[PDB]
Amino acid sequence: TKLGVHSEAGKLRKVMVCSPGLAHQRLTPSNCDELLFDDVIWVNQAKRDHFDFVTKMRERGIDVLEMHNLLTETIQNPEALKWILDRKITADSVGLGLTSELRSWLESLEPRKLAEYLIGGVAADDLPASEGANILKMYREYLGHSSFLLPPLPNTQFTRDTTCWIYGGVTLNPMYWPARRQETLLTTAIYKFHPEFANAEFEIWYGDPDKDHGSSTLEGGDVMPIGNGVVLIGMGERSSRQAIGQVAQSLFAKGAAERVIVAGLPKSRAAMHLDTVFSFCDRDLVTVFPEVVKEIVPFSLRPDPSSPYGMNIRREEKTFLEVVAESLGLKKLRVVETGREQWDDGNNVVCLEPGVVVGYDRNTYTNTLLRKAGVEVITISASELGRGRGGGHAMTCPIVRDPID
Amino acid sequence: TKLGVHSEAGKLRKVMVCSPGLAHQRLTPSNCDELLFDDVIWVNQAKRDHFDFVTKMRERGIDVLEMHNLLTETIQNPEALKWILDRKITADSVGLGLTSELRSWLESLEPRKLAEYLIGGVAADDLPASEGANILKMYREYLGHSSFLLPPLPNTQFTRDTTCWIYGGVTLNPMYWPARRQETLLTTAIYKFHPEFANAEFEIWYGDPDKDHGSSTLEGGDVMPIGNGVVLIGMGERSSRQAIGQVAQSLFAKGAAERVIVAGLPKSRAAMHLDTVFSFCDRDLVTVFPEVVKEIVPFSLRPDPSSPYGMNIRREEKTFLEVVAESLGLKKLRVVETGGREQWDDGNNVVCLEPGVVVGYDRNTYTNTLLRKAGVEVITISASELGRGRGGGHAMTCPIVRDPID
Amino acid sequence: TKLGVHSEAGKLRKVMVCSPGLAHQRLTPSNCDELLFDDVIWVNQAKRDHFDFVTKMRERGIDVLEMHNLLTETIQNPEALKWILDRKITADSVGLGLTSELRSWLESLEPRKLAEYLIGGVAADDLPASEGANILKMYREYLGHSSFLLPPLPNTQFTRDTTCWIYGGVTLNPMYWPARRQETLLTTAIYKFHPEFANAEFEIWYGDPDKDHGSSTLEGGDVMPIGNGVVLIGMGERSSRQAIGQVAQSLFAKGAAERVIVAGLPKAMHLDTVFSFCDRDLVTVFPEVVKEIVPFSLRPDPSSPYGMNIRREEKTFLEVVAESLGLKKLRVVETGREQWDDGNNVVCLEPGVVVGYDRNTYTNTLLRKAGVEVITISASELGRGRGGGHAMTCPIVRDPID
Amino acid sequence: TKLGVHSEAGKLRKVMVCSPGLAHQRLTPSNCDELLFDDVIWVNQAKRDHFDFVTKMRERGIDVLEMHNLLTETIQNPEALKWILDRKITADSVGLGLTSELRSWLESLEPRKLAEYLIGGVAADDLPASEGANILKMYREYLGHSSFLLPPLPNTQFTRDTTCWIYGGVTLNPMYWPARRQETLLTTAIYKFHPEFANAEFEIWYGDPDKDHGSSTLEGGDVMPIGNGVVLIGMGERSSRQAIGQVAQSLFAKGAAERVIVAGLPKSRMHLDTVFSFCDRDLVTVFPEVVKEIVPFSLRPDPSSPYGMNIRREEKTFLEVVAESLGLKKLRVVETGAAEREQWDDGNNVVCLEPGVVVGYDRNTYTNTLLRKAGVEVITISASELGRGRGGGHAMTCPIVRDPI
Numbered sequence A: 001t002k003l004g005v006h007s008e009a010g011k012l013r014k015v016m017v018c019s020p021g022l023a024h025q026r027l028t029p030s031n032c033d034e035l036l037f038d039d040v041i042w043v044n045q046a047k048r049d050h051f052d053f054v055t056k057m058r059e060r061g062i063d064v065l066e067m068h069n070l071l072t073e074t075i076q077n078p079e080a081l082k083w084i085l086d087r088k089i090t091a092d093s094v095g096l097g098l099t100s101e102l103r104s105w106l107e108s109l110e111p112r113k114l115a116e117y118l119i120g121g122v123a124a125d126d127l128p129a130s131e132g133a134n135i136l137k138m139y140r141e142y143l144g145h146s147s148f149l150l151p152p153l154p155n156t157q158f159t160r161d162t163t164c165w166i167y168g169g170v171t172l173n174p175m176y177w178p179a180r181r182q183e184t185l186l187t188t189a190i191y192k193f194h195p196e197f198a199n200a201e202f203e204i205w206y207g208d209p210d211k212d213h214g215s216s217t218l219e220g221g222d223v224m225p226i227g228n229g230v231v232l233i234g235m236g237e238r239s240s241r242q243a244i245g246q247v248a249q250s251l252f253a254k255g256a257a258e259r260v261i262v263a264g265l266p267k268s269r270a271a272m273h274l275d276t277v278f279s280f281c282d283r284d285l286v287t288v289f290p291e292v293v294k295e296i297v298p299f300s301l302r303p304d305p306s307s308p309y310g311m312n313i314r315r316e317e318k319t320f321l322e323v324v325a326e327s328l329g330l331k332k333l334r335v336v337e338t339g340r341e342q343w344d345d346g347n348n349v350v351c352l353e354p355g356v357v358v359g360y361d362r363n364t365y366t367n368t369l370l371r372k373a374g375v376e377v378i379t380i381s382a383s384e385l386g387r388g389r390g391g392g393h394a395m396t397c398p399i400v401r402d403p404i405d
Numbered sequence B: 001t002k003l004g005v006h007s008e009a010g011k012l013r014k015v016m017v018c019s020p021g022l023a024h025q026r027l028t029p030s031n032c033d034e035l036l037f038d039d040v041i042w043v044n045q046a047k048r049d050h051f052d053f054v055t056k057m058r059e060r061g062i063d064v065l066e067m068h069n070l071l072t073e074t075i076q077n078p079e080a081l082k083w084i085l086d087r088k089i090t091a092d093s094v095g096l097g098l099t100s101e102l103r104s105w106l107e108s109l110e111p112r113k114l115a116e117y118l119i120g121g122v123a124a125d126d127l128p129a130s131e132g133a134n135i136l137k138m139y140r141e142y143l144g145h146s147s148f149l150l151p152p153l154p155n156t157q158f159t160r161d162t163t164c165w166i167y168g169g170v171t172l173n174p175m176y177w178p179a180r181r182q183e184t185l186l187t188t189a190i191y192k193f194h195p196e197f198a199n200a201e202f203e204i205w206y207g208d209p210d211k212d213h214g215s216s217t218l219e220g221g222d223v224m225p226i227g228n229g230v231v232l233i234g235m236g237e238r239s240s241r242q243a244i245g246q247v248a249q250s251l252f253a254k255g256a257a258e259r260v261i262v263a264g265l266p267k268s269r270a271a272m273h274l275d276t277v278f279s280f281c282d283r284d285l286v287t288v289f290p291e292v293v294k295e296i297v298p299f300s301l302r303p304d305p306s307s308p309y310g311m312n313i314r315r316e317e318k319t320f321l322e323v324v325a326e327s328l329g330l331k332k333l334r335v336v337e338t339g340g341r342e343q344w345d346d347g348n349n350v351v352c353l354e355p356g357v358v359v360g361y362d363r364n365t366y367t368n369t370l371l372r373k374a375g376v377e378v379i380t381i382s383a384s385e386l387g388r389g390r391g392g393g394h395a396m397t398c399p400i401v402r403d404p405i406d
Numbered sequence C: 001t002k003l004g005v006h007s008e009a010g011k012l013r014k015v016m017v018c019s020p021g022l023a024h025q026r027l028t029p030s031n032c033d034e035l036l037f038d039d040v041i042w043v044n045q046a047k048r049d050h051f052d053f054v055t056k057m058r059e060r061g062i063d064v065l066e067m068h069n070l071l072t073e074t075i076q077n078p079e080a081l082k083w084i085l086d087r088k089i090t091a092d093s094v095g096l097g098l099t100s101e102l103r104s105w106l107e108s109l110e111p112r113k114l115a116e117y118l119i120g121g122v123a124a125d126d127l128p129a130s131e132g133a134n135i136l137k138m139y140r141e142y143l144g145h146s147s148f149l150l151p152p153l154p155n156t157q158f159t160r161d162t163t164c165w166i167y168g169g170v171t172l173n174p175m176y177w178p179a180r181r182q183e184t185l186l187t188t189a190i191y192k193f194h195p196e197f198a199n200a201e202f203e204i205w206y207g208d209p210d211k212d213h214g215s216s217t218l219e220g221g222d223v224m225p226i227g228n229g230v231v232l233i234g235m236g237e238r239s240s241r242q243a244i245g246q247v248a249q250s251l252f253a254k255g256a257a258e259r260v261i262v263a264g265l266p267k268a269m270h271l272d273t274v275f276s277f278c279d280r281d282l283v284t285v286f287p288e289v290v291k292e293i294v295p296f297s298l299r300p301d302p303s304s305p306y307g308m309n310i311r312r313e314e315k316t317f318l319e320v321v322a323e324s325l326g327l328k329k330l331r332v333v334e335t336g337r338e339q340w341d342d343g344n345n346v347v348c349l350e351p352g353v354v355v356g357y358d359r360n361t362y363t364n365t366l367l368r369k370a371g372v373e374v375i376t377i378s379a380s381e382l383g384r385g386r387g388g389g390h391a392m393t394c395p396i397v398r399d400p401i402d
Numbered sequence D: 001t002k003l004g005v006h007s008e009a010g011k012l013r014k015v016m017v018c019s020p021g022l023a024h025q026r027l028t029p030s031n032c033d034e035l036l037f038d039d040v041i042w043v044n045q046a047k048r049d050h051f052d053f054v055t056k057m058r059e060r061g062i063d064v065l066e067m068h069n070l071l072t073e074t075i076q077n078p079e080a081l082k083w084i085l086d087r088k089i090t091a092d093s094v095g096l097g098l099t100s101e102l103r104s105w106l107e108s109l110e111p112r113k114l115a116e117y118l119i120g121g122v123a124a125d126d127l128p129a130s131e132g133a134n135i136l137k138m139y140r141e142y143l144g145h146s147s148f149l150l151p152p153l154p155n156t157q158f159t160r161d162t163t164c165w166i167y168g169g170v171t172l173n174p175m176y177w178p179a180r181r182q183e184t185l186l187t188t189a190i191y192k193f194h195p196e197f198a199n200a201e202f203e204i205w206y207g208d209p210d211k212d213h214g215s216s217t218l219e220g221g222d223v224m225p226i227g228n229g230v231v232l233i234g235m236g237e238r239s240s241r242q243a244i245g246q247v248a249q250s251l252f253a254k255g256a257a258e259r260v261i262v263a264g265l266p267k268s269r270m271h272l273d274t275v276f277s278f279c280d281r282d283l284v285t286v287f288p289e290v291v292k293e294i295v296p297f298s299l300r301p302d303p304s305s306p307y308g309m310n311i312r313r314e315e316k317t318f319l320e321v322v323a324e325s326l327g328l329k330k331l332r333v334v335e336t337g338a339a340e341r342e343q344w345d346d347g348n349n350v351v352c353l354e355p356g357v358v359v360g361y362d363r364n365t366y367t368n369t370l371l372r373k374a375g376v377e378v379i380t381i382s383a384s385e386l387g388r389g390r391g392g393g394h395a396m397t398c399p400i401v402r403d404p405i
């Protein structure tokens, strides 16, 4: 089947996940926050928890693609490896006194360790001896500077955000935190050169790891192509209006979407994606974080030949849940709120098929409700995986998912 | 003479400054820390204090250029205004639905006002009424998002960092904090089009608003062309090795410097430039914040004709105050310690007008009484407002022409 | 002419203030924050400004009492000194290894100096060489531990908070931040022994520095005896409900008040920071916060086992206040034009006369239009402590109106 | 019955623990920060984990006492109950309007449950409908005010800290953070009225929940009666010199210790047992960066002193000082946190069960691996949930009876 994602709840054919790796081995107490993690994690156990997760879907007939294995196969291709380093290793990222050797040693590496380093990041102490690399070791100890030639990209674990598919099209997103900004290059190389993508039919709606985006930032966790030619997009936090306006315009220009419902998320330095406060568990069933979903102001954005920028905004008077409801042809949306006994946040489950969802073991209360609501809930352990502030939805990137209606 | 800064102590002939303005009237308790200010300031009083500063430099023969002025004149040439708006207003900065509204509006303003808007930023309601401004206005009144089309840039007040002159040439600095990165486009426009620059002779050693630069960040406050063919550059905080390398590489190619003393500064996300902890007051005098300077690891970048990159970095094994001293044929630097004997003192960051004549803040009476006992004449300005901005005289000046010392 | 405050706009006849001093001299980029200052200030300048604030007041016939002076006089009476030192210098505060040398050292000083220290705190370096003092220094030099035997109390500058007068009585307030709790004792001593107070006739409605009040915290800037046997008290930020309820109870039981309008505050800031009187029916306000104030009326009631009734007022805070004073409506000047400005916290010297800061030109001019003579002082240093005229004044005698 | 802890390494015969509970059910993402937790924890899971820890210690002969159980039994004695309530329910803690109600309500509950409320906190909501309680509900409803009459004390989980045995006696700690301060009254009530203590013999070196203490703070995690009349106490973070000085004196006056070794802790934002732990007779785990910065000071008795003590600064690294005081040439050391490591790891805070047997967290594989090579048996437990409270086995245990070596 032609690549493409046509809803949030239909049968999921092909997903991309990224297992914890070397990046997380590089987490430290004094750097985890800047690396967007609540704390260091026990990496080995996290690989086990992630694999079990891979397994629970790769036993449901879903073809789960792992990012390391894809990069790996992708760089085995000489051309493809030339394309990434040419843009990754440079005078402005690595240093003119190191670019040569860093690239040399990396090009020396077996494909699979190379790919491990493109995601995990490279430390001065990982290159062969040179005076260029020894002073770094020195800057870092002596002064407390970073020694990373290439940085650790632990959030690649969150494939939901680096790129997202919108009905047979994908966006290569300009990440908000600089800490996750280098991710797009890699995933972009994959779609560019990997056999699973290269001779495949599909559009690149918006994005370009080569271009500098400034204030336009978009992250997949804020994107949901729900099925009517309608697309939901959260705004004001990770995704900016500059960004949504250009994606919307593209999608309208190719007829990919008929309407985009912008979800205005009240501001907060506490950055949260749409999928963190609102998820789909089935045709007419969603879990939500009430406190945050009742504050959201929806604006419908539709194409407009009678407008210079070819579109028309309009603010929706009812509530987000009300708006999404009609936009799907519903009398209403069944609802499970995530905030008896302890606090719980069971938002961010991912649908595998309508009626089947994968979430975290620890949200027993939100999960029993989901079940009393006819949803089969498969749980995976959030002990380590969840320390990165994301769940099932955040750990998946749908590439092929069937429509619903 | 030619445009060019050849020391830190030599006779100041031409300085650029930027007066507090609209950008500052935009300060609020909730935005001031991201805008790099300690608190809101009384702008009319700031303006007075800044002009007192200008005046005290003007009555000494120094030619004091003020950024708003320069921007305004520059704006008069349609070409300069085209080049700037062409770059400041994109769907990636302002948004597909407000680009035409904004630029057209800005073009309707008289030069000096539009100048004030480019520096001070543009909010939604600053614009004539329209759907665009309104949808923009709601995002803020319902969701609390920023209405700023153009962002205010209050740190333009610190002329020192945005760009800097190293001997006979300038650098267009790619700022550390997002909140200052848009400053560079504005000054570059002046050096390009304004008459005092457009024809003058100087070299542009490093920089370009039109490029990404990525991990390369450089800031004037961390650059000192102390003279004798050397340049001191603080590293680790606002300025990165990725940038310095290129700077040192360019200065050597064109024989503008013979060596660069890279000052390795202890880390602290709490920012902090080299001129805030170390400062020349006189040819052999310097103020210093002990607690950070005696943690500086010195290094020397010298051009090496036989290296793929063309230069060697030897770590010095003497203290920074020793590596500096010796690089000016100096036995030893004389020092005045800052950061407190009666109360705390933050006397670094003064600025030399001529060997033996500095300008600093009135409040640092200790440091000042010592600079004076060490034979310096210290002129003072008020810190009450200009200082809630985290900067001193040095921070508020950008020498364009300062004489050789020797 | 008895002691008491019977309004916020009435003719001020006697006030306590405290100039900046040794405490502020101890400010640093590293402690200022925890000492409740936005930064290190220029002290001598600060002292000149405060002195201007004082002279500007005295020129109006107001009896302005300086805390350092009150204290200095107070400790000239041996019993007073002892009373204070016994409480202040213990093994739990100073350390058993230094209570003797610190005390005998302090008692050797000229009163004035002694007081400067009680208010400014005392460092290990200030002491006469001793081994006790040396390890103290050692803890500082080698590990960054505080070398203060007695901590600096720069917030004494804000006399408004540590104690407050309500219709013929005062409260010794259990302070909220550990950084200001040591203030209460100093002032209690003054009220206890100083001749201006010792023989004066007045009630102590609430408080005791010798008692640990646990969750009961109460700060001056949240209290306002507006008149009509009514009393305003902001709650939820620096003043807790546990403190407020026992304060009301005492007032009602001694007949010193008819009603207590609790001002429920959202989410630190005292009441006089987002609301304050400028004239008989005129106030300054910070819209964003005052519009959210939930008011609760607290009155006497034989029905209740704790003998008090609470009703949540349906109308806004501005109205309830209005009505409580017989006014149909209060005239309001908002503080959120050329720039942002916070001009709340002025202090009235009488009806129509107010002292505030030079910087708040926009609010000062609107106040002038409302017919108020606005005397201004410099905020450049004094305001870095986060407090205006109202915060730096503790009315002792102030007439009512009507 | 001779209670007393005369070592860190010797045979653990009696410890007190405190299982996670109601207190932890009240953790929220907006309140965990100030409750000293890294995040909310899966309480039911955490309970099974604690039980595993508890069972593992019992299966080895150690007498393990559950703080809730002790409280419960203590509560049944009317006197004890009243000794607690009189002190815990006052106009200053609960407010005049609700003191009577709260007390009657509590006094009407089953002991076990009343103990759970005493440790877990009470919410206005938990009281039977009443005008008083509804007012408190509205301060929370309309102003966002805390509605706790009594506060949850989830850190009771860390019995290490609220009290601590030092040879033949114990200290009733005046806690550092106000969030843990109300823990002391409860354990003191236990030690004062519960049959397992009221009759046993032991001294009370220092402490009193009735007193205020001011700047005298002191916590169990900083205290170590290592043996030889020697006691180690970390200074500067949770425990202050004004407290340490009073304790040393009390032990010196009663002849329970010869010397107190104050371990100068570098300035703040952690307890001593968090960067230094005994695993055997001559073996300790160490967190290099902080341990190499500790400045030891020897505090010995002294008649010549008006206050009876004299303290001297030592130039020997902390590790030597402890070695020397234990009569050892030097301590075997295992560094946590430059070997051949795979990731960050923090295996400090293990607790010994007896010489050569320790209980640590399963996640710290590298450290437990070096500990095993040093000849220590390392029983592990899950930190998935327990550890989000910032503490290990040493922190979750309060040795009551531990023989010396």
Ligand SMILES: NC(=[NH2+])NCCC[C@H](N)C(=O)O
Pocket: A035, A036, A037, A155, A158, A160, A161, A180, A220, A221, A222, A273, A275, A276, A348, A388, A389, A390, A391, A393, A394
């Ligand atoms: N779609 C999501 N909810 N993603 C969660 C991503 C979490 C990751 N640590 C980040 O900061 O990006």
Ligand SMILES: NC(=[NH2+])NCCC[C@H](N)C(=O)O
Pocket: B035, B036, B037, B155, B158, B160, B161, B180, B220, B221, B222, B271, B273, B275, B276, B349, B389, B390, B391, B392, B394, B395
């Ligand atoms: N060279 C200097 N000292 N510059 C100081 C600039 C201060 C300004 N508020 C900033 O954070 O950028």
Ligand SMILES: NC(=[NH2+])NCCC[C@H](N)C(=O)O
Pocket: C035, C036, C037, C155, C158, C160, C161, C180, C220, C221, C222, C270, C272, C273, C345, C385, C386, C387, C388, C390, C391
């Ligand atoms: N009534 C007042 N506004 N008092 C202000 C006191 C300011 C002082 N820094 C404090 O934080 O307590």
Ligand SMILES: NC(=[NH2+])NCCC[C@H](N)C(=O)O
Pocket: D035, D036, D037, D155, D158, D160, D161, D180, D220, D221, D222, D271, D273, D274, D349, D389, D390, D391, D392, D394, D395
């Ligand atoms: N002895 C210890 N290591 N205790 C650790 C205590 C952890 C607890 N969350 C607190 O901050 O109090």
